[PDB]
Amino acid sequence: AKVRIYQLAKELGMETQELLELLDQMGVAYKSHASTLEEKDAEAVRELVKEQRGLQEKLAEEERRKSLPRRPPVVVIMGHVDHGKTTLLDYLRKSRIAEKEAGGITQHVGAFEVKTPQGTVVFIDTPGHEQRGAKVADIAVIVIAADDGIMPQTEEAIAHAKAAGAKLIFAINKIDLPQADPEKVKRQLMERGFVPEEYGGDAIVIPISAKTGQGVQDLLEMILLLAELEDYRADPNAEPRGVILESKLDKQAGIIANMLVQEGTFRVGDYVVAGEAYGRIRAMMDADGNQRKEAGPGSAVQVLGFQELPHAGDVVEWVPDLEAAKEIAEERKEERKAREEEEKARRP
Ligand SMILES: Nc1nc2c(ncn2[C@@H]2O[C@H](COP(=O)(O)OP(=O)(O)O)[C@@H](O)[C@H]2O)c(=O)[nH]1
Numbered sequence: 001a002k003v004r005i006y007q008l009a010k011e012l013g014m015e016t017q018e019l020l021e022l023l024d025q026m027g028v029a030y031k032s033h034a035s036t037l038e039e040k041d042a043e044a045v046r047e048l049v050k051e052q053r054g055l056q057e058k059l060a061e062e063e064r065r066k067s068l069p070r071r072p073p074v075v076v077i078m079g080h081v082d083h084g085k086t087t088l089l090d091y092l093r094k095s096r097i098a099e100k101e102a103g104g105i106t107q108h109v110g111a112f113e114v115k116t117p118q119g120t121v122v123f124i125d126t127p128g129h130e131q132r133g134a135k136v137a138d139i140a141v142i143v144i145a146a147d148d149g150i151m152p153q154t155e156e157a158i159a160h161a162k163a164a165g166a167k168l169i170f171a172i173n174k175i176d177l178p179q180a181d182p183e184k185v186k187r188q189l190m191e192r193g194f195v196p197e198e199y200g201g202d203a204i205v206i207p208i209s210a211k212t213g214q215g216v217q218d219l220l221e222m223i224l225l226l227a228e229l230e231d232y233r234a235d236p237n238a239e240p241r242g243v244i245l246e247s248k249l250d251k252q253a254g255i256i257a258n259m260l261v262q263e264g265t266f267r268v269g270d271y272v273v274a275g276e277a278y279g280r281i282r283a284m285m286d287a288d289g290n291q292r293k294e295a296g297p298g299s300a301v302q303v304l305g306f307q308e309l310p311h312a313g314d315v316v317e318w319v320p321d322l323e324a325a326k327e328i329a330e331e332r333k334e335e336r337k338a339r340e341e342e343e344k345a346r347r348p
Protein backbone atom coordinates (compact mmCIF):
# COMPACT_ATOMS: atom_id res chain seq x y z
CA ALA A 1 0.00 0.00 0.00
CA LYS A 2 1.12 3.55 0.82
CA VAL A 3 4.57 3.65 2.40
CA ARG A 4 6.04 6.50 4.43
CA ILE A 5 9.42 7.77 3.18
CA TYR A 6 11.24 6.79 6.37
CA GLN A 7 9.76 3.30 6.13
CA LEU A 8 10.96 2.85 2.55
CA ALA A 9 14.32 4.39 3.46
CA LYS A 10 14.73 1.76 6.16
CA GLU A 11 13.47 -0.93 3.76
CA LEU A 12 16.30 -0.17 1.36
CA GLY A 13 18.86 0.41 4.12
CA MET A 14 19.12 3.96 2.89
CA GLU A 15 19.96 7.30 4.49
CA THR A 16 17.12 9.77 5.08
CA GLN A 17 18.71 12.67 3.23
CA GLU A 18 20.01 10.26 0.59
CA LEU A 19 16.48 9.13 -0.26
CA LEU A 20 15.21 12.70 -0.09
CA GLU A 21 17.61 13.89 -2.80
CA LEU A 22 16.81 10.75 -4.77
CA LEU A 23 13.16 11.81 -4.73
CA ASP A 24 14.29 15.32 -5.65
CA GLN A 25 16.11 14.14 -8.77
CA MET A 26 13.23 11.78 -9.60
CA GLY A 27 10.89 14.77 -9.55
CA VAL A 28 8.69 13.44 -6.75
CA ALA A 29 7.38 16.17 -4.43
CA TYR A 30 7.00 15.77 -0.66
CA LYS A 31 6.80 17.69 2.62
CA SER A 32 9.18 15.76 4.85
CA HIS A 33 10.43 12.20 5.33
CA ALA A 34 7.15 11.66 7.18
CA SER A 35 5.28 12.15 3.89
CA THR A 36 3.47 9.21 2.33
CA LEU A 37 4.74 7.89 -1.00
CA GLU A 38 2.37 6.69 -3.68
CA GLU A 39 2.49 3.13 -4.96
CA LYS A 40 3.91 4.06 -8.37
CA ASP A 41 6.58 6.35 -6.93
CA ALA A 42 7.57 3.90 -4.18
CA GLU A 43 8.05 1.14 -6.74
CA ALA A 44 9.99 3.50 -9.01
CA VAL A 45 12.36 4.13 -6.11
CA ARG A 46 12.92 0.42 -5.42
CA GLU A 47 13.54 -0.11 -9.13
CA LEU A 48 15.87 2.87 -9.57
CA VAL A 49 17.89 1.93 -6.49
CA LYS A 50 18.28 -1.62 -7.79
CA GLU A 51 19.66 -0.32 -11.10
CA GLN A 52 22.03 2.19 -9.49
CA ARG A 53 23.37 -0.46 -7.12
CA GLY A 54 23.57 -2.98 -9.95
CA LEU A 55 25.72 -0.77 -12.17
CA GLN A 56 27.97 0.15 -9.25
CA GLU A 57 28.84 -3.48 -8.55
CA LYS A 58 29.17 -4.12 -12.28
CA LEU A 59 31.34 -1.03 -12.77
CA ALA A 60 33.70 -2.15 -10.00
CA GLU A 61 34.03 -5.59 -11.58
CA GLU A 62 35.45 -4.24 -14.84
CA GLU A 63 37.92 -2.20 -12.82
CA ARG A 64 39.50 -5.00 -10.77
CA ARG A 65 39.74 -7.28 -13.81
CA LYS A 66 41.80 -4.48 -15.35
CA SER A 67 44.51 -5.58 -12.94
CA LEU A 68 46.18 -8.75 -14.23
CA PRO A 69 47.51 -11.34 -11.76
CA ARG A 70 51.21 -11.65 -11.00
CA ARG A 71 53.33 -14.27 -12.74
CA PRO A 72 56.63 -15.78 -11.53
CA PRO A 73 59.97 -14.77 -13.13
CA VAL A 74 61.40 -17.18 -15.70
CA VAL A 75 65.14 -17.54 -15.20
CA VAL A 76 67.82 -19.05 -17.44
CA ILE A 77 71.45 -19.79 -16.52
CA MET A 78 74.43 -19.13 -18.79
CA GLY A 79 78.20 -18.60 -19.06
CA HIS A 80 81.48 -20.38 -19.86
CA VAL A 81 81.86 -24.15 -19.44
CA ASP A 82 83.12 -25.37 -16.03
CA HIS A 83 81.96 -22.12 -14.41
CA GLY A 84 79.28 -23.98 -12.43
CA LYS A 85 76.01 -23.67 -14.39
CA THR A 86 75.07 -27.31 -13.75
CA THR A 87 76.16 -27.19 -10.11
CA LEU A 88 74.01 -24.12 -9.49
CA LEU A 89 70.93 -25.68 -11.08
CA ASP A 90 71.46 -28.85 -9.05
CA TYR A 91 71.79 -26.92 -5.78
CA LEU A 92 68.69 -24.95 -6.75
CA ARG A 93 66.77 -28.14 -7.50
CA LYS A 94 67.73 -29.54 -4.10
CA SER A 95 66.84 -26.14 -2.60
CA ARG A 96 63.00 -25.98 -2.71
CA ILE A 97 62.11 -29.28 -0.96
CA ALA A 98 65.54 -29.43 0.78
CA GLU A 99 63.71 -30.40 3.88
CA LYS A 100 61.23 -33.11 2.80
CA GLU A 101 61.44 -36.89 2.31
CA ALA A 102 61.09 -37.32 -1.46
CA GLY A 103 58.10 -37.82 -2.74
CA GLY A 104 57.66 -36.39 -5.22
CA ILE A 105 57.13 -38.12 -7.49
CA THR A 106 59.65 -35.78 -9.16
CA GLN A 107 59.60 -35.63 -12.95
CA HIS A 108 61.62 -33.49 -15.38
CA VAL A 109 59.33 -31.03 -17.16
CA GLY A 110 61.96 -28.69 -18.61
CA ALA A 111 61.77 -26.17 -15.78
CA PHE A 112 61.35 -26.19 -12.00
CA GLU A 113 60.11 -23.80 -9.32
CA VAL A 114 61.79 -22.49 -6.20
CA LYS A 115 59.23 -21.60 -3.56
CA THR A 116 60.59 -18.79 -1.43
CA PRO A 117 59.07 -16.56 1.31
CA GLN A 118 59.34 -13.54 -0.99
CA GLY A 119 57.79 -15.44 -3.91
CA THR A 120 58.21 -18.14 -6.56
CA VAL A 121 61.00 -18.37 -9.14
CA VAL A 122 60.93 -20.48 -12.30
CA PHE A 123 64.26 -21.86 -13.53
CA ILE A 124 64.56 -23.22 -17.05
CA ASP A 125 66.54 -26.44 -16.85
CA THR A 126 67.12 -28.19 -20.18
CA PRO A 127 70.09 -29.77 -21.97
CA GLY A 128 71.66 -28.00 -24.95
CA HIS A 129 73.09 -24.56 -25.64
CA GLU A 130 72.87 -21.57 -27.97
CA GLN A 131 65.65 -18.81 -34.66
CA ARG A 132 65.61 -18.03 -31.97
CA GLY A 133 62.83 -19.78 -30.07
CA ALA A 134 60.16 -17.31 -28.97
CA LYS A 135 60.99 -15.42 -25.79
CA VAL A 136 61.29 -17.71 -22.77
CA ALA A 137 63.50 -16.29 -20.01
CA ASP A 138 62.86 -12.91 -18.37
CA ILE A 139 66.14 -13.04 -16.47
CA ALA A 140 69.50 -14.50 -17.46
CA VAL A 141 71.93 -15.31 -14.66
CA ILE A 142 75.44 -15.07 -16.09
CA VAL A 143 77.71 -17.30 -14.04
CA ILE A 144 81.37 -16.33 -13.73
CA ALA A 145 84.01 -18.39 -11.95
CA ALA A 146 86.00 -16.22 -9.55
CA ASP A 147 89.20 -18.21 -10.16
CA ASP A 148 88.95 -17.81 -13.93
CA GLY A 149 86.99 -14.67 -14.73
CA ILE A 150 85.42 -13.31 -17.90
CA MET A 151 86.11 -15.35 -21.05
CA PRO A 152 85.12 -14.67 -24.68
CA GLN A 153 82.40 -17.29 -24.10
CA THR A 154 81.10 -15.25 -21.18
CA GLU A 155 80.87 -12.22 -23.45
CA GLU A 156 79.07 -14.31 -26.04
CA ALA A 157 76.49 -15.41 -23.46
CA ILE A 158 76.01 -11.83 -22.20
CA ALA A 159 75.44 -10.71 -25.79
CA HIS A 160 73.04 -13.59 -26.47
CA ALA A 161 70.98 -12.91 -23.37
CA LYS A 162 70.58 -9.22 -24.18
CA ALA A 163 69.67 -9.90 -27.81
CA ALA A 164 66.94 -12.27 -26.61
CA GLY A 165 65.64 -9.48 -24.37
CA ALA A 166 66.63 -10.95 -21.00
CA LYS A 167 67.52 -8.83 -17.97
CA LEU A 168 71.04 -9.63 -16.80
CA ILE A 169 72.18 -10.75 -13.36
CA PHE A 170 75.86 -11.53 -12.80
CA ALA A 171 76.69 -14.30 -10.35
CA ILE A 172 80.33 -14.62 -9.37
CA ASN A 173 80.76 -18.25 -8.48
CA LYS A 174 83.41 -20.32 -6.69
CA ILE A 175 84.01 -17.67 -4.01
CA ASP A 176 84.89 -20.53 -1.66
CA LEU A 177 88.15 -21.06 -3.56
CA PRO A 178 91.36 -19.56 -2.10
CA GLN A 179 92.49 -18.34 -5.53
CA ALA A 180 89.13 -16.65 -6.11
CA ASP A 181 89.29 -12.94 -6.93
CA PRO A 182 85.71 -11.54 -6.94
CA GLU A 183 87.01 -7.97 -7.17
CA LYS A 184 88.99 -8.80 -10.31
CA VAL A 185 85.81 -10.01 -11.96
CA LYS A 186 84.06 -6.79 -10.87
CA ARG A 187 86.81 -4.85 -12.64
CA GLN A 188 86.35 -7.00 -15.73
CA LEU A 189 82.65 -6.13 -15.76
CA MET A 190 83.36 -2.40 -15.41
CA GLU A 191 85.99 -2.53 -18.15
CA ARG A 192 83.16 -3.80 -20.34
CA GLY A 193 80.70 -1.18 -19.14
CA PHE A 194 78.80 -3.17 -16.54
CA VAL A 195 79.00 -1.15 -13.34
CA PRO A 196 77.88 -2.84 -10.09
CA GLU A 197 75.10 -1.17 -8.09
CA GLU A 198 77.42 -0.66 -5.11
CA TYR A 199 79.41 1.69 -7.36
CA GLY A 200 76.23 3.40 -8.55
CA GLY A 201 75.64 1.53 -11.80
CA ASP A 202 72.65 -0.58 -12.82
CA ALA A 203 74.54 -3.88 -13.10
CA ILE A 204 73.26 -6.47 -10.63
CA VAL A 205 76.13 -8.55 -9.28
CA ILE A 206 76.12 -11.22 -6.58
CA PRO A 207 78.88 -13.44 -5.09
CA ILE A 208 77.94 -17.12 -4.81
CA SER A 209 79.28 -20.56 -3.99
CA ALA A 210 77.36 -23.27 -5.83
CA LYS A 211 79.34 -25.80 -3.79
CA THR A 212 78.54 -24.25 -0.42
CA GLY A 213 75.25 -22.52 -1.12
CA GLN A 214 76.59 -19.18 0.07
CA GLY A 215 74.87 -16.24 -1.59
CA VAL A 216 72.35 -18.50 -3.31
CA GLN A 217 69.46 -17.54 -1.02
CA ASP A 218 70.48 -13.93 -1.62
CA LEU A 219 70.63 -14.45 -5.39
CA LEU A 220 66.98 -15.54 -5.25
CA GLU A 221 65.85 -12.42 -3.39
CA MET A 222 67.62 -10.34 -6.01
CA ILE A 223 65.82 -12.14 -8.84
CA LEU A 224 62.48 -11.50 -7.14
CA LEU A 225 63.40 -7.88 -6.46
CA LEU A 226 64.15 -7.33 -10.13
CA ALA A 227 60.84 -9.00 -10.87
CA GLU A 228 58.97 -6.70 -8.49
CA LEU A 229 60.56 -3.80 -10.39
CA GLU A 230 59.80 -5.29 -13.81
CA ASP A 231 56.28 -6.16 -12.64
CA TYR A 232 55.60 -9.35 -14.59
CA ARG A 233 51.93 -10.17 -15.09
CA ALA A 234 49.80 -12.40 -17.32
CA ASP A 235 46.12 -12.91 -18.09
CA PRO A 236 44.96 -16.42 -17.10
CA ASN A 237 41.78 -15.88 -19.14
CA ALA A 238 43.52 -14.79 -22.36
CA GLU A 239 43.68 -17.21 -25.29
CA PRO A 240 46.23 -19.85 -24.16
CA ARG A 241 49.74 -19.27 -25.48
CA GLY A 242 52.90 -21.18 -24.59
CA VAL A 243 56.36 -22.21 -25.78
CA ILE A 244 57.91 -25.63 -26.40
CA LEU A 245 60.88 -26.21 -24.11
CA GLU A 246 61.66 -29.63 -25.56
CA SER A 247 60.09 -32.57 -27.40
CA LYS A 248 60.89 -36.22 -26.73
CA LEU A 249 59.95 -39.76 -27.70
CA ASP A 250 59.08 -42.33 -25.06
CA LYS A 251 58.99 -46.03 -25.95
CA GLN A 252 55.65 -46.66 -24.23
CA ALA A 253 54.07 -43.20 -24.12
CA GLY A 254 55.14 -42.06 -27.58
CA ILE A 255 55.62 -38.41 -28.51
CA ILE A 256 55.83 -36.14 -25.45
CA ALA A 257 56.52 -32.41 -25.17
CA ASN A 258 57.47 -30.02 -22.39
CA MET A 259 55.99 -26.54 -22.69
CA LEU A 260 56.13 -23.34 -20.67
CA VAL A 261 52.75 -21.69 -20.30
CA GLN A 262 52.91 -17.92 -20.82
CA GLU A 263 49.38 -16.58 -21.32
CA GLY A 264 45.91 -17.99 -20.72
CA THR A 265 45.13 -21.39 -19.26
CA PHE A 266 45.53 -24.68 -21.14
CA ARG A 267 43.08 -27.46 -20.30
CA VAL A 268 42.97 -31.22 -20.92
CA GLY A 269 41.00 -31.79 -24.12
CA ASP A 270 42.21 -28.58 -25.72
CA TYR A 271 43.40 -28.66 -29.31
CA VAL A 272 46.80 -27.05 -29.71
CA VAL A 273 49.17 -26.36 -32.58
CA ALA A 274 52.94 -25.79 -32.39
CA GLY A 275 54.65 -24.95 -35.66
CA GLU A 276 53.62 -27.74 -38.02
CA ALA A 277 52.74 -29.96 -35.06
CA TYR A 278 49.20 -30.30 -33.71
CA GLY A 279 47.27 -32.42 -31.24
CA ARG A 280 44.66 -32.72 -28.53
CA ILE A 281 45.93 -32.40 -25.01
CA ARG A 282 45.44 -35.86 -23.53
CA ALA A 283 47.20 -35.27 -20.21
CA MET A 284 49.49 -32.92 -18.32
CA MET A 285 52.01 -33.57 -15.56
CA ASP A 286 53.84 -30.93 -13.53
CA ALA A 287 57.29 -31.02 -11.91
CA ASP A 288 55.76 -32.73 -8.86
CA GLY A 289 54.36 -35.62 -10.90
CA ASN A 290 50.77 -34.59 -10.30
CA GLN A 291 48.26 -34.88 -13.12
CA ARG A 292 47.01 -31.49 -14.25
CA LYS A 293 43.61 -30.56 -15.63
CA GLU A 294 44.73 -26.96 -16.08
CA ALA A 295 48.00 -25.10 -16.55
CA GLY A 296 48.22 -21.32 -16.14
CA PRO A 297 50.89 -18.68 -16.79
CA GLY A 298 54.31 -19.73 -15.50
CA SER A 299 53.36 -23.41 -15.35
CA ALA A 300 55.76 -25.89 -16.94
CA VAL A 301 53.96 -29.09 -17.91
CA GLN A 302 54.61 -32.28 -19.83
CA VAL A 303 52.00 -32.58 -22.57
CA LEU A 304 50.60 -35.72 -24.23
CA GLY A 305 48.71 -35.90 -27.51
CA PHE A 306 50.96 -34.14 -30.02
CA GLN A 307 50.73 -35.80 -33.44
CA GLU A 308 54.32 -34.92 -34.35
CA LEU A 309 57.33 -33.89 -32.28
CA PRO A 310 57.21 -30.11 -31.98
CA HIS A 311 60.39 -28.02 -32.13
CA ALA A 312 61.97 -26.31 -29.15
CA GLY A 313 60.99 -22.64 -29.10
CA ASP A 314 57.84 -22.97 -31.21
CA VAL A 315 54.75 -21.23 -29.85
CA VAL A 316 52.00 -23.51 -28.59
CA GLU A 317 48.70 -22.02 -29.77
CA TRP A 318 45.14 -22.80 -28.73
CA VAL A 319 42.67 -23.72 -31.46
CA PRO A 320 38.87 -24.33 -31.30
CA ASP A 321 38.77 -27.79 -32.90
CA LEU A 322 40.76 -30.55 -34.60
CA GLU A 323 39.91 -29.21 -38.05
CA ALA A 324 41.54 -25.86 -37.30
CA ALA A 325 44.59 -27.55 -35.78
CA LYS A 326 45.12 -29.62 -38.93
CA GLU A 327 44.56 -26.75 -41.35
CA ILE A 328 46.80 -24.36 -39.41
CA ALA A 329 49.53 -26.99 -39.12
CA GLU A 330 49.33 -27.97 -42.79
CA GLU A 331 49.51 -24.43 -44.16
CA ARG A 332 52.77 -24.05 -42.22
CA LYS A 333 54.03 -27.44 -43.36
CA GLU A 334 53.26 -26.39 -46.93
CA GLU A 335 54.86 -22.98 -46.49
CA ARG A 336 58.18 -24.56 -45.51
CA LYS A 337 58.27 -27.22 -48.23
CA ALA A 338 57.11 -25.08 -51.17
CA ARG A 339 59.54 -22.33 -50.13
CA GLU A 340 62.40 -24.84 -50.04
CA GLU A 341 62.54 -24.96 -53.84
CA GLU A 342 63.10 -21.22 -53.55
CA GLU A 343 66.36 -21.84 -51.67
CA LYS A 344 67.32 -24.71 -54.01
CA ALA A 345 66.30 -23.86 -57.59
CA ARG A 346 67.81 -20.45 -56.76
CA ARG A 347 71.35 -19.59 -55.61
CA PRO A 348 72.94 -22.40 -53.53
N1 LIG B 1 84.63 -25.03 -5.21
C1 LIG B 1 83.59 -24.82 -6.05
N2 LIG B 1 83.49 -25.60 -7.16
C2 LIG B 1 82.47 -25.45 -8.03
C3 LIG B 1 81.46 -24.42 -7.76
N3 LIG B 1 80.57 -24.49 -8.78
C4 LIG B 1 80.99 -25.47 -9.62
N4 LIG B 1 82.12 -26.04 -9.17
C5 LIG B 1 82.88 -27.15 -9.81
O1 LIG B 1 83.08 -26.93 -11.21
C6 LIG B 1 83.09 -28.18 -11.89
C7 LIG B 1 82.22 -28.09 -13.13
O2 LIG B 1 80.99 -27.47 -12.76
P1 LIG B 1 79.74 -27.47 -13.77
O3 LIG B 1 78.48 -27.03 -13.06
O4 LIG B 1 79.55 -28.81 -14.43
O5 LIG B 1 80.17 -26.34 -14.83
P2 LIG B 1 79.19 -25.90 -16.02
O6 LIG B 1 79.75 -26.35 -17.34
O7 LIG B 1 79.07 -24.40 -16.01
O8 LIG B 1 77.84 -26.54 -15.81
C8 LIG B 1 82.53 -29.22 -10.93
O9 LIG B 1 83.55 -30.16 -10.59
C9 LIG B 1 82.12 -28.45 -9.69
O10 LIG B 1 82.49 -29.15 -8.50
C10 LIG B 1 81.63 -23.61 -6.53
O11 LIG B 1 80.81 -22.71 -6.23
N5 LIG B 1 82.69 -23.86 -5.75
Ligand SMILES: [Mg+2]
Nearest residue numbers: 082085086087
Ligand atom coordinates in the same frame (compact mmCIF):
# COMPACT_ATOMS: atom_id res chain seq x y z
MG1 LIG C 1 78.47 -29.01 -17.03
